[model samples]
Target: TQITGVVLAAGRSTPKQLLPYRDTTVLGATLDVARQAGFDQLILTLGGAASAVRAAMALDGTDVVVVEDCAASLRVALARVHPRATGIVLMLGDQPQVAPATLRRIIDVGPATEIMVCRYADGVGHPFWFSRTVFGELARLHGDKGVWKLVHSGRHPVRELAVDGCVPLDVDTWDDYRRLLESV
Candidate 1:
C-alpha cells in the first residue's frame, strides 16, 4: 500500500514557510515529518514565494509543483497525483510542529474509508488522509476553506483519531509565525 503526501506551501502572508525555525525552514520541518513517516511519494505545491521555498527544502524524493494561484494550489496539487497512488496524505507547508509520530499514527490505519483526520485534544486538525476512492470529491475544494468542506461533510465516511497535545500551529499570520518560532 503506497501512501502519497501532498504539502501546500504557497502563502501570501510574509513567506511563512521560509520563516526561520531552529536549523531548518518551516516547510523543511513539515516535510521532514512526512519523510520520516515513510510516504512512498511526496508532492509539494508552491505559490507566493515558491523560489525561496524550493531553496529552503531539499527537492530529493519530493515533487515540486508550482501554482500561480495560491488559492488554487491545493486543487492543482491534487490534480498531479499518480494514477496508481493508493492514498495521499494532506500536510501543511507552514505548520512545522507536526511530528513524525503523529503521522505514523494517522497512516497506521493502512487502507480506510473516505478520510482520516487527527482529533486533537481541543478539536480536529491535519494532516488529513484521503483514500484514492474519495479523492474526486475535491473538485469543489477551492480557496482557504475548501478543504474543510470535505473534512466536515457527513457525505463521506470519516475516521478521526485522538492525538496527544494541542493542534499544531499553522503559520499564516505574524502571530502564528512568532508562535511557531517560539515553539521550536
Candidate 2:
C-alpha cells in the first residue's frame, strides 16, 4: 500500500517547524528523516503564512503536496488528507529528534488497526500510523482534540513498536528550541 508522510507543520505559535536548529530548521530536519525512511509521498500542511513556509522549504516535484487550510488542530488537518492516502504516518514538524530508524520500524510493523503508536520509555508517542481503514474515522474528526480519543476508545486494534530513547521532544516554545540546540 502507499504510505504518505504527512508532516504537520502548521502551528500558529512560533512556527516551531521553522525555528532554527543547529544547521537546519526543525521542518527541514524532520523532512530529511521522513524522506530517508522511504515514504512514497510527502505532504506538508501549511496554515497562516503558508507562502513564507513554502518559500523556505523550496520543495519541488509532485511527490510533495503543500496543502493550505485554516488554523485547525492536527487531527483536522490529517482528516483533510486522509482520502487520497492509503496508509498515513502522522509526524510532527517540530520533532527533529525522531530518528529515521524509528520511523522505518513503525512502518515495518504495519498495524492493522486505527492507530499504531511508538512505545517509548515514558509512554506511547508519535509518529502515529493509520491504515486506510481508519480514514473514515479520521475524516469525521472534529475540534482541537487529537486522535487520542479514537485510539483510547479501543474499537480497533493498536500495536506498539518498541523504540529506544525516541523521545517526543516537540519544540513548542523558545525554551524547547534552546534545549534541542544544546543537545544537538
Candidate 3:
C-alpha cells in the first residue's frame, strides 16, 4: 500500500515547535525521523511559527502547509495527500524522541485498511497509522479530541504495536520540555 506522512506542528505555546531537543528543533527532528523512515512525500503542517521553525533549522524535501490548529491541519493535509496514498503515518510536531526504527516497525506491522497505533503498556499513542478508507472520517474531524474520540470509538478494529517505553514525550508544557532535556 502507498503510505504518506504528515507531521502536525502548529501550536501557540512558547513556540514549542522550535524548542531544541538535541541537535535539532522539535519539528525539525520529527521531519528528520519521517524522512529516515523513507517517506518520499511529507506534509508538515505549521500554525504561525513557520518562520521561527525555519530559523531554528534548515529543512528540505517536504511540502509545508500553513495550518491554524491541529484539527484544521489534519483535515487540510488529508485533503492534499497524494491520490494514490493508501495509508498515512501521522506524527506529532513536538515529539523529538520518536526513533525511526520504531516508526519503521509500525509501518511494517500494518493491516493498512485498519487503524494502527502504539501500545506502551499504559495506552495508545502515535505515530498513528490511518488507512485511506477512513480519509473521509479524518476530513470531518473538527477538533483535537475528535481524532482521539475516533480512536476510542471502537467502531473499527485497531492493531497495536507494543512499544518498550512510556508514551514518547511531547513538549506540551515546560515540564515536558525539561523532562525531554533531562532524558536526552
Candidate 4:
C-alpha cells in the first residue's frame, strides 16, 4: 500500500528545508525521494515563512499540505497532519541522506502497534511509520518530544528495523551541513 509522506519543514531560524544541497533545496530532494519511493501523497508542514518554502520547493502537482501553528516541534507538526493521513512516514528535511530503499523497506515491513523506528549505528531515528491506530495519540502530542513519549511510555510496542545509512544527523548548524556536503 502507498503511504503518505509527511515532511516537517516548519522550523524556526534557518529554514533547513530551503538549505541548498547539490542543485536543489533539502525539501526538494526529500520530495523527490518520497515520490520515487512510491508515496501517493506528500504533506509539508510549515510554521514560519511559508512563502519562502513554497518558492524554494517545487510543490507543483504534489499533495502539499501546509500547517501554520507548527509549535516549533516535529511532534506538533505530525499531530497537525495525523488526522489527514492513513499511514504516516515522517521524514525530516535535514536528514537528506535517508535513502529511498530504506523507505521502501520500512513500508514493506508494514505497520506495527507502536512506532516503526529506523535503526542506525548511532541509534534509532526518524522516518518513523505510524498507522491510523495511533492517530489520536499522535494528534494529542506536544512539544519537541515527538512520538518518543508514546513509544517508550509503554503505551505501544515498537518494532525496530535495521536500516543502513539511516543516520539521524540533522543539519541544524553549519558544521552539520558541511559534513553532509562533504560526505556526498
Kindly list the per-residue Cα lDDT of model 1 for residues 1-184, writing each as its tens digit: 5778898887676477777777877777888777898877889888868887766566788888886743767667777788777777888888778888888877778356569889999899998988887766664555646877778888888899788999999888888777876754
Q: 2 or 3: which has the higher TM-score? A: 3
Better of 1 and 2 by TM-score: 1
Give the residue spans of candidate 2 off by over 4 A.
62-70, 73-85, 111-113
Clashes in each model (backbone N, CA, C under 3 Å)? 0, 0, 0, 0
TM-score top scorer: 3
- CA lDDT scores, all candidates in order: 0.79, 0.71, 0.79, 0.70
User: Per-residue lDDT for 35-120 in model 4, tens only?
Assistant: 77777676666766578887766677455545465363454444445345567787876677788888888777746434688788
Question: What residue pairs are clashing in model 3?
Answer: none
Error of 3 at 52 (Å): 1.8
lDDT per residue for candidate 2 within 39-158, as digits (tens), equals 767767666656776777766531343444423445545544535566788887778888898888877776454678888898888888988787767766763245767766678788
TM-score of 4: 0.84
| Candidate 2 CA-lDDT value | 0.71
Q: What is the per-residue lDDT of model 3 for residues 1-184, given as tens digits with 9 covering 90 to 100?
A: 4678888887668588877767767777778888999775888888878777777676678878886644478887777799887778889888877889888887776645489888886688888888988889988887544778887667989778888878888788999889988974
Show the lowest summed lDDT stretch of 10 residues, model 1.
Answer: 136-145
Model 4 alpha-carbon drift over 4 Å, by segment: 68-86
